[PDB]
Structure formats: structure tokens, C-alpha cells
């Protein structure tokens, strides 16, 4: 059965006005799996709420899982880790049997108290960033998943992971067959392919080769097709591969506004959105409205990569719209993938300000998957 894995960045409740996105803004019938991001750990592996005022005191954990009262078939998971949590503590925790056991027991306790149906492990990433034990992380990550699976089978809980996409990244972190063996599915983060950290403009989630890229050694390029075909060939069965898609774009400052193709020189991060409020990225809800309200933007489609981009003076923006989302889900259908994972629900056009219905990206996913 095809699944739709909706990540919910819970900090979105602090956004103002039309950017505010609470648990009550979720449509629980547009997802099959809803993921509460994020919880974290300390250096001894103790699972902990990162925002206890919201998660615990104001009952956000329980409000989230209570969505099952509306859609009884919905699964609600909690996600541990993420970008801001780093890699060091997960490396330290994974390497010690005492710390693994403490992570298993304290995360299980939180999952059961607050009525979650499972755990999404988003360690970014084994043997990367500020990892402590380096290459040992790869095997110890799989040992952690095995001990988690052994504990979770006593309660019927789901165990899932979010992982880096392209081969150059994945080989640093995972033994693919061992990971796929223990999880219910693998959510491949097939986005952030390029971004403001690069010296040239590039697409956030290009499906295939992009304009300005060399067709020589195509398999080393950062795109969704390369990533998905890597993970399938490395040993992830299609029925455990969930393909990530972004509900946001990434923004660049052009070095020269007249050189505005993909793979043009860039000077760092571009505009920020009104609610996400970070230079270098913009929610789809924010940018479809920005495009709507300022006709000076030039929107083009990269017909090689199957994704749109837009420029105005010094701004250059890669993003995904209904057409590129359709292309992505059709691609996933065409390789019999298990489903779609989206980051993240709170930057869909949930108010429908952009003339394509409420939740146009999420509704597109549901519609193209259903067919
Ligand atoms: C091909 C290749 O390998 N390219 C890499 C590229 O991947 C690297 O970029 C990083 O990619 C990873 C995925 O592999 C990104 O991590 C994913 O994707 C989500 C969206 O990118 C990411 O969301 C971020 O989560 C942060 C928390 O961890 C959010 O911080 C929050 O900011 C809020 C204000 O906006 C604030 O209120 C919150 O308190 C704060 N949260 C916390 C707990 O502090 C951040 O806003 C959010 N970004 C969004 C929404 O756009 C997730 O963490 C993670 N998801 C999952 C499921 O794991 C990672 O974000 C990318 N890095 C950066 C810097 O963007 C790149 C590194 O430079 O290198 C390329 O080579």
C-alpha cells in the first residue's frame, strides 16, 4: 500500500498570522503517517523533548497523536534527531551498549506515554559532521536499529529512518542492506541537492540532469533519479523506499543578475520568507504568494531537471510547484516505490492563497499516488 509520510515541523506554531500552523491545521486524511519533529537526546542517549513547554505542558504531543481520533487509520510517529541536533551525541550513544539501552528505554517510554505509533530515527549523519567515532558509526547505526527493532516488536511499534540521498553521501554513513532489514521503511531525503552553500545556483530537488551540468559521469550528479536508483541497487527493496520531496525552495544571491541560468555564479543566500525567516530558503506557501504578488519575477522551467526556478534582479530561487510535484510522484509510482515523504507539511499552501486549492502539493501527492 502506498503511503504518504508527512513531517510536521512543530516549531511552526510560533509563526504569526497566515504562517502559523498548529496541530489543528493538519488534515489527517491527507497523510497515512504523520511525524512529530523533533525530539532529541543528551550525551547518555536519554530521549528528551526539545520544547517541553510546547510538547509537554501545552499537550502538543498528545494533541498530535489525538489526530487518530479523526482518522483511525493514521499512524503518528515521533522523530528523534534532525539537522540542529547534530551527529556527535548520536555517535557517542550508538557506540556504547549502556547508552543504546538507555536511548531505547527512554524513547520507548515517551512513545507509549503520548500514544505514538513509532519512532523515526533522523541521525544526520553516521560518520559525518561532528561524529565522534567516525567510521564505527556505520556499523553501530545498524546495531542500534536492530536493538530498537527487537524492543519495538514487543509493542507493535513502527521503526523508520530518514537518510541522506545521493551515493556520495550514503556510502559514508549506511550499510544499506542492514538498515533496510530492520526498519519498516527508509525515507530518502531526496532534496537539498544544491543550495546557498554552493558557489553556483542549482536546484533543490532536480529529478534528472540540470541545465549547465555536464553529461559526463552523469551518475555522480546530485539529483533525485541518481539517489533513488542508488538506494534500489544498494539493497533497499522498493516496498521499503519512501522518496522525499520538498515543500520549500532554496534562495541564492546572484553574482551577476544577468547570468541567471541554473549553475550560474552565486554569492551566498538569497531572500527569506516572512514566516520561515531564514535567508537561503523559503516555504512553498511563502514563495507562491511572493510570485503571485510581484509580477516582475521571471519563472522558468528547467526542462532537463523537470523543476522550476525564478529570478528577479539579484534573487535566484529554486522551488517545486504542482507540476514538478506531479513529475516527482509519477517518477516514484513508475519505480513502484513505497510512497512519498514530504518536508514539511507546514509550508504547503495550506491556506490556498495561491489559486490551486488548499494543500496543493499534498493534494497533488495524494491524487497522483492514488492513480
Ligand atoms: C546532496 C547532499 O548531500 N547535499 C548536502 C545537503 O543535504 C546538506 O543540507 C542538509 O540536508 C539535510 C538533509 O540531508 C537537511 O536536513 C533535513 O531536511 C530538512 C530540511 O532541509 C531539515 O529541516 C530543518 O530542521 C531544522 C532542525 O533540525 C530546522 O531548524 C529549526 O528552525 C526553526 C526556525 O526556522 C526554529 O524555530 C527551530 O527551533 C529549529 N529547530 C531546532 C530543533 O532547532 C530548520 O528550520 C529546518 N529547515 C527547513 C525547514 O528548511 C531537517 O532537519 C532534516 N529532516 C529530516 C527528516 O531529517 C539539512 O537541513 C540541510 N542543511 C542545511 C544547512 O540546510 C548540506 C549542508 O550544508 O550539504 C550538502 O552537500
Amino acid at each position: 500500500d502506498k503511503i504518504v509520510v508527512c513531517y510536521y515541523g512543530t516549531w511552526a506554531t510560533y509563526r504569526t498570522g497566515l504562517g502559523k500552523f498548529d496541530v489543528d491545521d493538519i488534515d489527517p486524511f491527507l497523510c497515512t503517517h504523520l511525524v512529530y519533529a523533533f525530539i532529541g537526546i543528551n550525551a547518555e542517549g536519554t530521549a528528551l523533548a526539545l520544547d517541553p513547554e510546547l510538547d509537554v505542558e501545552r499537550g502538543n504531543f498528545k494533541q498530535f497523536t489525538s489526530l487518530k481520533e479523526k482518522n483511525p487509520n493514521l499512524k503518528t510517529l515521533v522523530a528523534v534527531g534532525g539537522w540542529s541536533e547534530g551527529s556527535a551525541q548520536y555517535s557517542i550513544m550508538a557506540a556504547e551498549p549502556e547508552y543504546r539501552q538507555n536511548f531505547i528505554q527512554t524513547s520507548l517510554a515517551m512513545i507509549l506515554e503520548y500514544n505514538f505509533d513509532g519512532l523515526d530515527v533522523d541521525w544526520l549523519y553516521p560518520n559525518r559532521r561532528d561524529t565522534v567515532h567516525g567510521e564505527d558509526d556505520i556499523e553501530q547505526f545498524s546495531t542500534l536499529l536492530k536493538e530498537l527493532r527487537e524492543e519495538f516488536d514487543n509493542y507493535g511499534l513502527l521503526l523508520t529512518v530518514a537518510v541522506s540521498a545521493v551515493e556520495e553521501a550514503a556510502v559514508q554513513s549506511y550499510d544499506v542492506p542492514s538498515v533496510a532489514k530492520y526498519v519498516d521503511y527508509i525515507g530518502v531525503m531526496t532534496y537539498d541537492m544544491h543550495g546557498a552553500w554552493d558557489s553556483v545556483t542549482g536546484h533543490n530537488a532536480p529529478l534528472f540532469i540540470s541545465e549547465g551540468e555536464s553529461a559526463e559521469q552523469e551518475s555522480t550528479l546530485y539529483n533525485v533519479n541518481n539517489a533513488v536508483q542508488y538506494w534500489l541497487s544498494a539493497g533497499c527493496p522498493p516496498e521499503k523506499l519512501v522518496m522525499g520531496v520538498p515543500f520549500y525552495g532554496r534562495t541564492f544571491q546572484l553574482s551577476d543578475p544577468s547570468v541567471n541560468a541554473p549553475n550560474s555564479p552565486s554569492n551566498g543566500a538569497g531572500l527569506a520568507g516572512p514566516y520561515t525567516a531564514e535567508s537561503g530558503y523559503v516555504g512553498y506557501n511563502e514563495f507562491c504568494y511572493i510570485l503571485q504578488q510581484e509580477s516582475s519575477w521571471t519563472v522558468q522551467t528547467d526542462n532537463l531537471a523537470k523543476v522550476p526556478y525564478a529570478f528577479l534582479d539579484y534573487n535566484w530561487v529554486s522551488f517545486d510547484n504542482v507540476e514538478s510535484m506531479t513529475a516527482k510522484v509519477e517518477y516514484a509510482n513508475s519505480f513502484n516505490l513505497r510512497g512519498i515523504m514530504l518536508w514539511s507539511i507546514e509550508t504547503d499552501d495550506f491556506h490556498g492563497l495561491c489559486g490551486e486549492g488548499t494543500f496543493p502539493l499534498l493534494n497533488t501527492i495524494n491524487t497522483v499516488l492514488a492513480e
Side-chain angles (χ1 to χ4, degrees):
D1 306 358
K2 303 294 113 138
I3 59 170
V4 183
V5 181
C6 297
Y7 277 85
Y8 173 33
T10 52
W11 50 91
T13 181
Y14 298 113
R15 296 169 181 172
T16 57
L18 293 169
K20 187 180 178 62
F21 192 102
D22 300 323
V23 176
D24 276 336
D25 296 300
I26 295 173
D27 185 340
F29 283 100
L30 292 178
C31 315
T32 61
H33 297 59
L34 265 159
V35 185
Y36 192 108
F38 289 108
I39 61 164
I41 73 179
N42 60 16
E44 68 184 344
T46 298
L48 55 94
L50 291 177
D51 185 357
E53 188 158 11
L54 169 69
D55 314 326
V56 173
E57 169 166 41
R58 296 172 54 207
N60 213 49
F61 279 154
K62 174 222 90 163
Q63 174 99 338
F64 185 84
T65 59
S66 284
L67 289 175
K68 287 184 278 173
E69 272 154 39
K70 304 216 164 304
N71 183 1
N73 301 320
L74 176 77
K75 300 293 183 164
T76 61
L77 297 75
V78 68
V80 58
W83 181 254
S84 281
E85 268 280 294
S87 178
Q89 311 208 294
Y90 298 92
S91 182
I92 291 162
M93 172 270 291
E96 282 298 335
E98 190 186 270
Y99 292 161
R100 295 203 298 271
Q101 273 323 309
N102 184 56
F103 173 71
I104 294 171
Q105 291 305 320
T106 61
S107 71
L108 173 73
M110 282 185 58
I111 288 161
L112 304 171
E113 169 179 358
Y114 296 111
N115 206 15
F116 284 103
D117 300 299
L119 179 68
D120 185 61
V121 179
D122 298 357
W123 170 3
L124 288 29
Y125 323 79
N127 188 24
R128 286 182 76 193
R129 297 176 78 203
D130 56 357
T131 167
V132 163
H133 298 290
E135 219 178 325
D136 299 349
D137 288 358
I138 304 172
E139 301 83 0
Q140 275 143 32
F141 182 49
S142 288
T143 299
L144 174 61
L145 297 176
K146 173 174 68 33
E147 301 178 349
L148 277 157
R149 167 59 62 192
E150 260 144 39
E151 192 54 43
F152 276 24
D153 277 1
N154 292 318
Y155 301 97
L157 296 165
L158 297 172
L159 173 70
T160 72
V161 299
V163 299
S164 62
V166 305
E167 167 173 6
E168 180 184 8
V171 296
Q172 291 178 66
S173 297
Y174 317 110
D175 182 77
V176 170
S178 183
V179 176
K181 175 183 201 166
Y182 297 121
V183 303
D184 289 278
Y185 55 83
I186 296 179
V188 188
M189 291 178 300
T190 36
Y191 41 72
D192 302 326
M193 300 284 174
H194 302 281
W197 52 85
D198 290 332
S199 67
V200 298
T201 62
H203 296 304
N204 183 34
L207 193 43
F208 305 109
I209 190 173
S210 312
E211 289 176 13
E213 282 190 315
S214 164
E216 279 61 16
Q217 62 184 351
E218 190 148 8
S219 75
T220 69
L221 300 172
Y222 300 165
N223 55 52
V224 173
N225 173 59
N226 276 349
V228 162
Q229 297 306 311
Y230 168 74
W231 276 88
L232 292 168
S233 75
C236 181
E239 70 263 14
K240 291 196 173 188
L241 205 167
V242 177
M243 188 186 102
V245 302
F247 280 20
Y248 61 96
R250 299 204 162 275
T251 72
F252 299 70
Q253 188 191 356
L254 291 163
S255 303
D256 186 339
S258 46
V259 181
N260 46 48
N263 280 286
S264 301
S266 57
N267 268 334
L271 65 90
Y275 315 111
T276 49
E278 161 187 326
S279 297
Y281 89 95
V282 61
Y284 174 73
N285 62 325
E286 301 170 316
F287 197 57
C288 72
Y289 186 77
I290 277 164
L291 285 181
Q292 190 148 90
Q293 295 300 274
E294 174 58 83
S295 67
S296 74
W297 285 91
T298 297
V299 186
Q300 308 229 31
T301 299
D302 186 330
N303 296 123
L304 292 167
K306 312 299 173 182
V307 282
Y309 65 95
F311 56 90
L312 170 60
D313 285 355
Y314 281 90
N315 295 292
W316 193 95
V317 176
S318 158
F319 68 112
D320 273 273
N321 53 16
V322 164
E323 181 186 357
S324 69
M325 193 60 60
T326 297
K328 278 168 170 70
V329 183
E330 282 174 341
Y331 176 87
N333 281 346
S334 76
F335 282 101
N336 195 33
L337 303 184
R338 182 67 183 289
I340 299 287
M341 147 191 104
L342 59 106
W343 184 278
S344 56
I345 191 168
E346 73 265 8
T347 58
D348 205 345
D349 185 25
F350 58 101
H351 284 299
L353 313 177
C354 297
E356 296 175 312
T358 58
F359 285 109
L361 303 185
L362 186 47
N363 268 298
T364 300
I365 293 164
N366 280 265
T367 290
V368 179
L369 270 174
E371 68 142 281

